[PDB]
């Protein structure tokens, strides 16, 4: 209603926010498949929050009842199995969407100036997401849950001096137990969700401060019409809202297909050994991380030394933080970067996929050799970026976006 | 090497036979404690009174979990390994693994319980289905001849062309109630019931997902039209 | 943009909104449905056999029936004579609007006068009232003659479980379906034979 | 049909 | 740093937000004791979130272990008793501070135009706080917890038709059980904390959009200096930040005194019967609500009809929502309202306190009579406001804040 | 009913040790203290761990175990007509004065199932388990001469020590709570001085 909105606008900047962030907010008109994933990440975050709240209504964060409570959700709670599969598939889809989101950032140089803070907030979001997923995977209290948590927290025992004390303090016990379960449940259910929501708010605020990149890397703000609207810019609402609605429907089709027909996804979304209750005294023949942690695992497994392996795994994630300063390309989009940048992006994607693929299996000779090679290539994609972004010859960026 | 089994979760009779087998030959050591007798009866189509009379031996109520008197610690002490809860074993191991495991027990005097398993070597489980299968041993028997996948059947009778092999599971004749096919069907029904127990929402999941996917295709049509239009 | 086709845009927006609302209702179905009583809740309860021969005069015992407390009170004579004297202060003296077995006395609300079996849950917001058999407590006033006093909002019932007039409790305390398996043993949960 | 399918394995012979 | 802040400001609205909300945001300079309580409410909310997160690391939301897990926090967890006392005394202090905040609003007409949205968001916050505190109080699973949950959930049973079905659906069971405990734990620990954070953000945003009232009720925006700064306005930072620091320290002194010397507060912060495990078959002889819920409970106890009592409590809470339209006074502050307004505000305060005091004890004849009289007076304070705010003669409002 | 005031001293290690002995011998038969551990009771009462295990742990439990008992609540509720509640928090549920008056208010009442009634807790289901010590108390309460091991003063001291141990059990953090709160309040006054001075400086 007009009168109601006039009353609200005098007392709340509802129309001002709507016209500043969604309507009258002009994003580049050449967004493609790769720009669906921010809104899909928001959708998956909302899905995780809702389904997690509902799982918490029935979950018991104790080592004696966590697994039994999960089965109670799966069997006794009306549609509880649906909610649980939504949550597990949503964690896996969160990581799928976020990895494609980050790879969009890599493809189009969207981390470069002025979006360095956008990229840093996104990386903080990624760190929070990794912590959240790791702490959630302990909650089912299956064999994989318990033993993956055991190994991941023993990593903190690799710190030369305070490692063992720090690991014990994190666990809350002399081993992984119900104390660790309840602690990780509290962190996973409130603390990290709050941190993630705040980080997403900061991320979107920074983006809207500096504006979106586009596949061509063209700074659309340079060319504006007589009204001040960029020539290659269109209002986010309604055009990209409807585009994102279509993308959300497609994502939901895939998501529900997985939920209702292949919730385990061949044992990757729900690992088979995790359907066995945690046993402190019998460890699985081969313990592997959830797929979305597998690449870094491979890196850690590629280093013969334990402390250096932990350091390399940490740096594998930390180097993405400094990525905005490693890229010295005069252009943003890979479309106009030199052959070296395209080759190294291909190498990085292939190495990441291979590291994930070989970190999901028991060690093998070829697996170990390729994991070490891919660790080298993964770190070289970043370490050599400041050089091969300068050696290459870049194409001239068009004044107007293509399409 | 596992043997494939085609498990029909819509077969109520097979699941009923599997539930009977589980309640008689398996619930002595194995619990199904994440699963209630009431839900098992409802999904298998067993009347509640019939479920009470025929499958509940522990004095539990219909709505009670399929708990057993054997404690995990006691059984771990007795057998050397705790008999795991079998509600989710179909998901943990898969149906093919279970089918091959329950048919791969063979006499092995070197072992604590006189038996070993091809699928699960040095397993701590006694061969509790020996009365049905009969004595199974690692001996010589006729096996279909295969040459680089060239599998020979009899063109006329349609039966395999076989040669002798001396590292095969052979059931000693006239040692068990059931022949090879009958024990195969018994194990198939048991594994079908275990597959149901691991994933009791499978059929409802498929139905609900079909309806969800139909709705999502409809909604996609409308959203795609609202997008392509409004992008002109 | 050249001549946007309105109406078509309006129709598509409306249709997409309606279909999305239907999908939202469907996606809410799991969350709303999971709040209904689960299989854990539906365990139900079986009848409870209570030995009532050991109840001293003017005393009550609590029987756990289907998760609820049942007041089984051995009623002395004096309170039985007092009960008819209270019909003027009771909303439903004849138990016309309360829940009780068809075979219990409309006024005494029990199979036999000397024993009263009452579902001990207040009919207003549902708690077990406190048993106050005393005649004239200072707090309960001089007109008191024994009965039940709800400790949340002070609903008053007489020893027959009948609520007083103008209390938060609108109904008499429910009488469970019970029988007398013996002269001194009752069972709560099974109706009495006709 | 279900009852026959569900018959317990153990049979006990009783006096009378 | 200057260079660092220049870098951030080109990528984030850091300095602009700081100078729009805290610095260069000119609040009236005559804030008194009654204006400490918004910042104190913020502090108590932060304390509740932090202490509740730490309690959730050791709490078991099951009927079998909730009470035992609370005692485990009190006895086995290092300093867990401190955190639990911070949490309980913080709930009590949250309601103390919020009630004083609402009473400031009543005194100075801070609900009046243009702050109607501020008041409505505050009332939504208060409803969320009531629900949050009730669900938290169920969590210890003491006798008080169980029977309060039983009564309050049966309140929904009062609805003539869908009441019983709604109460059963809210319970998740045919009686208050571990299902209800776990469900309310989920709502209390995530859902309502998230809702409360959002509502607090909306509340503060509305306040900053319309500006803050002051004890004199003088619209300081009318008179401005040549720089556009109100004559009676002072930058919120640093002056009111330091004033709020002093208020926070005083509040912390009282808070820690209660925590470390009187955590029970005579059984009004931690109720004595709640130290007994919940018993489905034994209702405590003194089943009374927490103090901050007593005034409404009293109202419900005053009405001799079940549904009418439930509706009376609901309306006692809901009338404060429409308060911004009940007050037709030409002046905001009670300092310049007529004798009728002052008398009726005194009557409302006395009635609220008397309802809370008699709602905190078992029914009595004088208690019942005073509860009924104070219920009538509480409702008349609102129903008669549109009249006695016009009948009364108001003093002129000064053009400048007094002090 | 009218309660008798008792001055409970939670710093008296000897009194708390005597109360723990009385609780372990006369009260843990039917009542659990399952929310506290033998180890913590020993540490707070100054009892060596070996001495605690030898003298106060009768159930075969470890020092670090909760003070559980064999009598299950359901069986006890059936037997006595009421479940003996866990007494770890009873000093907070009832208060030390109520406990002190209750444990001394048992008198002989043949009409009751256990032959006793209580002035503080009428028609209570507790048997008079301290009758050997107090003696035969009959109705005003009077103890029949030469019927108990202890006189009125000695039994009052015994009940006082027991109630002191119960008070400690309900609130094991009270002494540490006061010690920490003293320093917290000192620091908060120190910080208040600085905050007030800063506010005064800025508001010039
Ligand atoms: C087989 O195996 C393997 C796998 O697995 C199967 C794997 O996957 C992997 C691969 C692994 C991965 C890549 C996964 C990675 C996953 C992770 C990153 C998970 C890591 C998660 C953890 C281990 C958690 C660790 C958490 C830590 C260390 C952080 C701890 C933080 C705390 C405890 C917070 C401390 C609390 C605080 C500070 C309290 C708050 C303080 C206050 C002061 C509050 C405010 C108080 C007041 C206001 C009062 C005082 C008042 C003041 C200040 C005065 C003035 C007043 C004002 C208010 C102004 C590997 C290698 C592996 O091999
Ligand atoms: C003595 O005793 C007494 C006391 O005690 C001791 C007392 O104190 C009191 C005094 C009482 C008080 C004062 C206490 C008062 C306290 C209270 C008021 C507390 C009351 C609390 C409760 C009982 C809780 C009640 C809760 C209720 C009824 C609400 C329930 C809400 C839910 C379950 C949420 C509903 C779930 C939904 C809808 C899920 C969300 C749905 C979705 C669709 C999510 C989105 C899904 C998708 C995106 C998928 C579909 C995709 C779409 C839409 C397509 C388009 C794509 C896009 C994304 C755009 C008294 C009287 C007393 O005498
Ligand atoms: C035997 O065959 C070797 C094959 C290579 C590999 C995997 C081996 C040992 C250390 C590995 C490095 C540690 C540093 O870690 C990283 C990250 C940590 C940084 C501090 C140093 O650089 C690497 C770039 C560096 C690094 C991850 C790159 C690859 C190294 C094994
Ligand atoms: C039956 O009246 C009760 C009192 C007088 C009752 O005063 C009234 C005082 C006012 C008040 C609080 C009352 C009702 C509705 C209240 C309103 C609803 C609306 O809501 C709001 C919000 C919602 C909006 C939609 C509308 O507006 C408001 C603005 C409105 C509102 C909140 C304002 C205030 C209203 C009670 C007289 O009590 C007698 O005394 C005994 C009572 O128990 C009974 O005696 C029997 O039972 C005893 C057991 O104790 C034995 O002692 C005896 O032996 C045995 O005979 C006897 O039957 C009974 O009459
Ligand atoms: C129906 C006759 C039965 C089926 C089907 C299964 N069991 Fe058992 N079992 C027993 C023990 C002591 C073990 C542990 C052995 C070890 O860990 O080495 C087992 C194990 C299994 C397994 C393996 C599950 C896994 O994840 O590895 C399966 C699939 C299994 N059992 C199925 C003991 C007993 C027992 C006591 C005499 C009985 C009666 C049964 N098992 C019956 C069945
Ligand atoms: C079995 C013979 C008991 C022994 C030995 C002791 N107590 Fe007991 N107690 C017992 C029962 C069956 C009950 C419930 C009585 C009822 O009607 O509800 C109790 C109760 C108490 C209480 C009351 C606590 C409360 O109501 O909140 C207290 C304070 C108490 N008991 C203390 C107590 C002490 C100090 C004992 C050793 C001296 C002791 N009890 C032994 C049964 C038995
Ligand atoms: C980024 C957001 C989140 C991610 C990525 C995430 C991830 C996960 C994962 C991977 C699991 C393991 C599930 C399984 O394999 O069985 C899990 C479990 C769980 N999560 Fe989270 N989660 C998120 C948010 C939340 C929130 C906000 C809550 C509650 C408010 C929550 C509650 C739970 C509960 C109760 C479980 C245990 C039940 C179960 O395992 O399904 N989660 N989570
Ligand atoms: C996990 C939850 C996340 C959410 C909800 C989210 C949300 C969004 C949204 C809605 C957008 C705008 C639309 C789009 O560009 O897709 C966006 C852009 C962006 N995001 Fe994310 N994001 C998340 C995580 C991340 C991560 C992990 C990174 C990188 C490490 C990241 C980096 C970026 C960048 C650089 C942009 C702007 C790039 C451009 O304009 O092309 N985000 N984010
Ligand atoms: C419970 C958490 C709450 C928080 C954190 C909060 C926060 C604040 C803050 C920081 C202020 C400005 C500083 C101050 O006035 O002290 C404020 C003002 C205000 N609050 Fe709230 N508030 C809360 C609840 C409420 C409630 C329950 C109400 C009313 C029902 C309310 C109504 C108002 C009004 C009317 C103002 C403007 C006061 C004026 O301008 O004089 N707030 N709030
Ligand atoms: C406005 C915010 C909140 C309020 C007013 C509040 C209030 C309460 C209250 C009154 C209790 C009862 C405590 C007792 O009587 O012992 C409680 C319990 C509890 N709360 Fe909350 N709470 C809030 C937020 C939170 C949050 C955000 C969490 C978790 C992140 C949380 C976790 C818990 C837990 C675990 C308990 C049970 C343990 C205990 O009773 O100490 N609370 N809450
Ligand atoms: S709860 Fe019984 S009178 Fe209100």
Short mmCIF file of N, CA, C and O in Angstrom, two decimals, chain B residues 118-194:
data_model
loop_
_atom_site.label_atom_id
_atom_site.label_comp_id
_atom_site.label_asym_id
_atom_site.label_seq_id
_atom_site.Cartn_x
_atom_site.Cartn_y
_atom_site.Cartn_z
N UNK B 118 34.91 -66.05 3.64
CA UNK B 118 35.62 -65.53 2.48
C UNK B 118 35.52 -64.01 2.44
O UNK B 118 36.50 -63.30 2.20
N UNK B 119 34.31 -63.49 2.67
CA UNK B 119 34.09 -62.05 2.59
C UNK B 119 34.73 -61.34 3.77
O UNK B 119 35.31 -60.25 3.62
N UNK B 120 34.64 -61.92 4.96
CA UNK B 120 35.10 -61.31 6.21
C UNK B 120 36.09 -62.29 6.83
O UNK B 120 35.74 -63.02 7.77
N UNK B 121 37.32 -62.33 6.33
CA UNK B 121 38.29 -63.30 6.87
C UNK B 121 38.51 -63.10 8.36
O UNK B 121 38.57 -61.97 8.85
N UNK B 122 38.63 -64.21 9.07
CA UNK B 122 38.88 -64.20 10.51
C UNK B 122 37.78 -63.47 11.27
O UNK B 122 38.03 -62.88 12.32
N UNK B 123 36.56 -63.50 10.75
CA UNK B 123 35.44 -62.89 11.45
C UNK B 123 35.20 -63.64 12.76
O UNK B 123 35.40 -64.86 12.85
N UNK B 124 34.76 -62.91 13.78
CA UNK B 124 34.47 -63.48 15.07
C UNK B 124 33.09 -64.07 15.21
O UNK B 124 32.71 -64.49 16.30
N UNK B 125 32.31 -64.10 14.13
CA UNK B 125 30.93 -64.57 14.16
C UNK B 125 30.88 -66.08 13.97
O UNK B 125 31.49 -66.60 13.03
N UNK B 126 30.20 -66.82 14.84
CA UNK B 126 29.97 -68.25 14.56
C UNK B 126 29.00 -68.43 13.40
O UNK B 126 28.14 -67.59 13.14
N UNK B 127 29.14 -69.56 12.71
CA UNK B 127 28.26 -69.88 11.60
C UNK B 127 26.90 -70.32 12.13
O UNK B 127 26.64 -71.52 12.29
N UNK B 128 26.02 -69.36 12.40
CA UNK B 128 24.74 -69.66 13.05
C UNK B 128 23.69 -70.18 12.08
O UNK B 128 22.65 -70.69 12.52
N UNK B 129 23.93 -70.07 10.77
CA UNK B 129 23.03 -70.62 9.77
C UNK B 129 23.52 -71.96 9.22
O UNK B 129 22.99 -72.43 8.22
N UNK B 130 24.52 -72.56 9.87
CA UNK B 130 24.97 -73.89 9.45
C UNK B 130 23.84 -74.91 9.42
O UNK B 130 23.80 -75.71 8.47
N UNK B 131 22.92 -74.96 10.39
CA UNK B 131 21.82 -75.93 10.29
C UNK B 131 21.02 -75.80 9.00
O UNK B 131 20.55 -76.81 8.47
N UNK B 132 20.85 -74.58 8.49
CA UNK B 132 20.11 -74.37 7.25
C UNK B 132 20.98 -74.66 6.03
O UNK B 132 20.64 -75.50 5.20
N UNK B 133 22.11 -73.96 5.92
CA UNK B 133 22.99 -74.16 4.78
C UNK B 133 23.57 -75.57 4.77
O UNK B 133 23.67 -76.20 3.72
N UNK B 134 23.95 -76.08 5.94
CA UNK B 134 24.73 -77.29 6.02
C UNK B 134 26.21 -76.99 6.06
O UNK B 134 26.66 -75.84 5.97
N UNK B 135 27.00 -78.05 6.21
CA UNK B 135 28.44 -77.90 6.32
C UNK B 135 29.02 -77.40 5.00
O UNK B 135 28.87 -78.05 3.96
N UNK B 136 29.68 -76.25 5.05
CA UNK B 136 30.34 -75.66 3.89
C UNK B 136 31.84 -75.67 4.11
O UNK B 136 32.31 -75.33 5.20
N UNK B 137 32.59 -76.09 3.08
CA UNK B 137 34.03 -76.30 3.19
C UNK B 137 34.72 -75.73 1.96
O UNK B 137 34.11 -75.51 0.91
N UNK B 138 36.02 -75.50 2.10
CA UNK B 138 36.87 -75.04 1.00
C UNK B 138 37.40 -76.30 0.33
O UNK B 138 38.42 -76.87 0.74
N UNK B 139 36.70 -76.76 -0.71
CA UNK B 139 37.06 -78.00 -1.38
C UNK B 139 37.03 -77.92 -2.88
O UNK B 139 37.12 -76.82 -3.46
N UNK B 140 36.88 -79.07 -3.53
CA UNK B 140 36.80 -79.18 -4.98
C UNK B 140 35.36 -79.35 -5.39
O UNK B 140 34.64 -80.18 -4.81
N UNK B 141 34.92 -78.57 -6.37
CA UNK B 141 33.58 -78.72 -6.92
C UNK B 141 33.59 -78.20 -8.35
O UNK B 141 34.58 -77.62 -8.82
N UNK B 142 32.48 -78.41 -9.05
CA UNK B 142 32.37 -77.99 -10.44
C UNK B 142 32.01 -76.52 -10.51
O UNK B 142 31.04 -76.08 -9.90
N UNK B 143 32.80 -75.76 -11.27
CA UNK B 143 32.57 -74.33 -11.48
C UNK B 143 32.56 -74.07 -12.98
O UNK B 143 33.32 -74.69 -13.73
N UNK B 144 31.70 -73.15 -13.41
CA UNK B 144 31.58 -72.85 -14.82
C UNK B 144 32.93 -72.41 -15.39
O UNK B 144 33.66 -71.63 -14.76
N UNK B 145 33.25 -72.91 -16.57
CA UNK B 145 34.53 -72.60 -17.21
C UNK B 145 34.45 -71.20 -17.82
O UNK B 145 33.49 -70.87 -18.53
N UNK B 146 35.45 -70.38 -17.54
CA UNK B 146 35.51 -69.01 -18.04
C UNK B 146 36.92 -68.76 -18.56
O UNK B 146 37.90 -69.11 -17.90
N UNK B 147 37.01 -68.15 -19.75
CA UNK B 147 38.29 -67.83 -20.38
C UNK B 147 38.25 -66.37 -20.82
O UNK B 147 37.66 -66.05 -21.85
N UNK B 148 38.88 -65.49 -20.03
CA UNK B 148 38.89 -64.06 -20.32
C UNK B 148 37.47 -63.52 -20.46
O UNK B 148 37.17 -62.72 -21.34
N UNK B 149 36.59 -63.97 -19.57
CA UNK B 149 35.19 -63.60 -19.63
C UNK B 149 34.36 -64.44 -20.57
O UNK B 149 33.14 -64.24 -20.63
N UNK B 150 34.97 -65.36 -21.31
CA UNK B 150 34.24 -66.25 -22.22
C UNK B 150 33.55 -67.30 -21.37
O UNK B 150 34.11 -68.35 -21.05
N UNK B 151 32.30 -67.02 -21.00
CA UNK B 151 31.53 -67.89 -20.12
C UNK B 151 30.74 -68.89 -20.97
O UNK B 151 29.97 -68.48 -21.84
N UNK B 152 30.94 -70.18 -20.71
CA UNK B 152 30.34 -71.24 -21.50
C UNK B 152 29.13 -71.80 -20.78
O UNK B 152 29.24 -72.32 -19.67
N UNK B 153 27.97 -71.70 -21.43
CA UNK B 153 26.78 -72.43 -21.01
C UNK B 153 26.52 -73.56 -22.00
O UNK B 153 27.11 -73.63 -23.08
N UNK B 154 25.63 -74.47 -21.61
CA UNK B 154 25.22 -75.53 -22.51
C UNK B 154 24.21 -74.97 -23.51
O UNK B 154 23.12 -74.57 -23.09
N UNK B 155 24.52 -74.93 -24.80
CA UNK B 155 23.55 -74.36 -25.75
C UNK B 155 22.19 -75.02 -25.69
O UNK B 155 21.17 -74.34 -25.81
N UNK B 156 22.15 -76.34 -25.49
CA UNK B 156 20.88 -77.06 -25.53
C UNK B 156 20.12 -76.94 -24.21
O UNK B 156 19.01 -76.40 -24.17
N UNK B 157 20.71 -77.43 -23.13
CA UNK B 157 20.05 -77.40 -21.83
C UNK B 157 20.12 -76.03 -21.17
O UNK B 157 19.34 -75.77 -20.24
N UNK B 158 21.02 -75.15 -21.60
CA UNK B 158 21.14 -73.85 -20.99
C UNK B 158 21.86 -73.84 -19.66
O UNK B 158 21.91 -72.79 -19.01
N UNK B 159 22.40 -74.97 -19.23
CA UNK B 159 23.12 -75.05 -17.97
C UNK B 159 24.61 -74.84 -18.20
O UNK B 159 25.12 -75.07 -19.30
N UNK B 160 25.34 -74.41 -17.17
CA UNK B 160 26.76 -74.07 -17.38
C UNK B 160 27.59 -75.29 -17.75
O UNK B 160 27.29 -76.42 -17.36
N UNK B 161 28.64 -75.04 -18.53
CA UNK B 161 29.68 -76.03 -18.77
C UNK B 161 30.76 -75.85 -17.72
O UNK B 161 31.33 -74.75 -17.60
N UNK B 162 31.05 -76.90 -16.97
CA UNK B 162 31.80 -76.79 -15.73
C UNK B 162 33.08 -77.61 -15.78
O UNK B 162 33.15 -78.65 -16.45
N UNK B 163 34.08 -77.14 -15.05
CA UNK B 163 35.31 -77.87 -14.79
C UNK B 163 35.58 -77.85 -13.29
O UNK B 163 35.07 -77.00 -12.56
N UNK B 164 36.39 -78.80 -12.84
CA UNK B 164 36.64 -78.97 -11.41
C UNK B 164 37.62 -77.91 -10.91
O UNK B 164 38.62 -77.62 -11.57
N UNK B 165 37.32 -77.33 -9.74
CA UNK B 165 38.21 -76.38 -9.07
C UNK B 165 38.27 -76.68 -7.58
O UNK B 165 37.23 -76.90 -6.94
N UNK B 166 39.48 -76.67 -7.01
CA UNK B 166 39.73 -77.08 -5.63
C UNK B 166 40.05 -75.91 -4.70
O UNK B 166 40.92 -76.04 -3.84
N UNK B 167 39.38 -74.77 -4.86
CA UNK B 167 39.42 -73.73 -3.83
C UNK B 167 38.05 -73.07 -3.74
O UNK B 167 37.92 -71.84 -3.68
N UNK B 168 36.99 -73.88 -3.74
CA UNK B 168 35.64 -73.37 -3.85
C UNK B 168 34.82 -73.75 -2.63
O UNK B 168 35.08 -74.76 -1.97
N UNK B 169 33.82 -72.91 -2.32
CA UNK B 169 32.89 -73.20 -1.24
C UNK B 169 31.92 -74.29 -1.70
O UNK B 169 31.15 -74.09 -2.65
N UNK B 170 31.97 -75.44 -1.04
CA UNK B 170 31.10 -76.57 -1.36
C UNK B 170 30.35 -76.99 -0.11
O UNK B 170 30.95 -77.14 0.96
N UNK B 171 29.04 -77.17 -0.24
CA UNK B 171 28.21 -77.62 0.87
C UNK B 171 28.22 -79.14 0.88
O UNK B 171 27.91 -79.78 -0.13
N UNK B 172 28.57 -79.72 2.03
CA UNK B 172 28.59 -81.18 2.13
C UNK B 172 27.17 -81.71 1.95
O UNK B 172 26.23 -81.19 2.59
N UNK B 173 26.94 -82.71 1.10
CA UNK B 173 25.56 -83.13 0.82
C UNK B 173 24.85 -83.64 2.06
O UNK B 173 25.45 -84.24 2.96
N UNK B 174 23.54 -83.40 2.11
CA UNK B 174 22.67 -83.92 3.17
C UNK B 174 23.18 -83.51 4.55
O UNK B 174 23.19 -84.31 5.49
N UNK B 175 23.60 -82.25 4.68
CA UNK B 175 24.05 -81.71 5.95
C UNK B 175 23.24 -80.52 6.43
O UNK B 175 23.42 -80.09 7.58
N UNK B 176 22.34 -79.98 5.61
CA UNK B 176 21.53 -78.85 6.01
C UNK B 176 20.11 -79.01 5.52
O UNK B 176 19.83 -79.75 4.57
N UNK B 177 19.20 -78.28 6.18
CA UNK B 177 17.79 -78.37 5.83
C UNK B 177 17.54 -77.88 4.41
O UNK B 177 16.75 -78.47 3.67
N UNK B 178 18.21 -76.80 4.01
CA UNK B 178 17.96 -76.15 2.74
C UNK B 178 19.06 -76.48 1.74
O UNK B 178 20.24 -76.59 2.10
N UNK B 179 18.67 -76.65 0.47
CA UNK B 179 19.64 -76.79 -0.60
C UNK B 179 20.23 -75.43 -0.95
O UNK B 179 19.93 -74.41 -0.31
N UNK B 180 21.07 -75.39 -1.98
CA UNK B 180 21.75 -74.14 -2.33
C UNK B 180 20.74 -73.06 -2.71
O UNK B 180 20.87 -71.91 -2.27
N UNK B 181 19.74 -73.40 -3.52
CA UNK B 181 18.76 -72.41 -3.93
C UNK B 181 17.89 -71.97 -2.77
O UNK B 181 17.58 -70.78 -2.63
N UNK B 182 17.47 -72.91 -1.92
CA UNK B 182 16.63 -72.56 -0.78
C UNK B 182 17.39 -71.68 0.21
O UNK B 182 16.84 -70.70 0.73
N UNK B 183 18.65 -72.01 0.49
CA UNK B 183 19.44 -71.16 1.37
C UNK B 183 19.72 -69.81 0.72
O UNK B 183 19.77 -68.79 1.41
N UNK B 184 19.90 -69.79 -0.60
CA UNK B 184 20.05 -68.52 -1.31
C UNK B 184 18.83 -67.64 -1.11
O UNK B 184 18.95 -66.45 -0.85
N UNK B 185 17.64 -68.23 -1.23
CA UNK B 185 16.41 -67.47 -1.03
C UNK B 185 16.26 -67.02 0.42
O UNK B 185 15.80 -65.91 0.69
N UNK B 186 16.64 -67.88 1.37
CA UNK B 186 16.59 -67.50 2.78
C UNK B 186 17.49 -66.30 3.06
O UNK B 186 17.08 -65.32 3.69
N UNK B 187 18.73 -66.36 2.56
CA UNK B 187 19.66 -65.26 2.77
C UNK B 187 19.19 -64.02 2.03
O UNK B 187 19.37 -62.89 2.50
N UNK B 188 18.58 -64.20 0.86
CA UNK B 188 18.06 -63.05 0.12
C UNK B 188 16.94 -62.37 0.89
O UNK B 188 16.90 -61.14 0.95
N UNK B 189 16.03 -63.14 1.47
CA UNK B 189 14.97 -62.55 2.27
C UNK B 189 15.53 -61.85 3.50
O UNK B 189 15.08 -60.75 3.86
N UNK B 190 16.52 -62.47 4.15
CA UNK B 190 17.13 -61.83 5.31
C UNK B 190 17.81 -60.52 4.94
O UNK B 190 17.66 -59.51 5.64
N UNK B 191 18.55 -60.51 3.83
CA UNK B 191 19.23 -59.29 3.41
C UNK B 191 18.23 -58.26 2.93
O UNK B 191 18.46 -57.05 3.07
N UNK B 192 17.10 -58.69 2.36
CA UNK B 192 16.05 -57.76 1.99
C UNK B 192 15.46 -57.09 3.23
O UNK B 192 15.23 -55.87 3.24
N UNK B 193 15.23 -57.86 4.29
CA UNK B 193 14.74 -57.27 5.53
C UNK B 193 15.77 -56.32 6.12
O UNK B 193 15.41 -55.25 6.64
N UNK B 194 17.05 -56.68 6.07
CA UNK B 194 18.08 -55.79 6.58
C UNK B 194 18.17 -54.51 5.76
O UNK B 194 18.40 -53.43 6.30
#
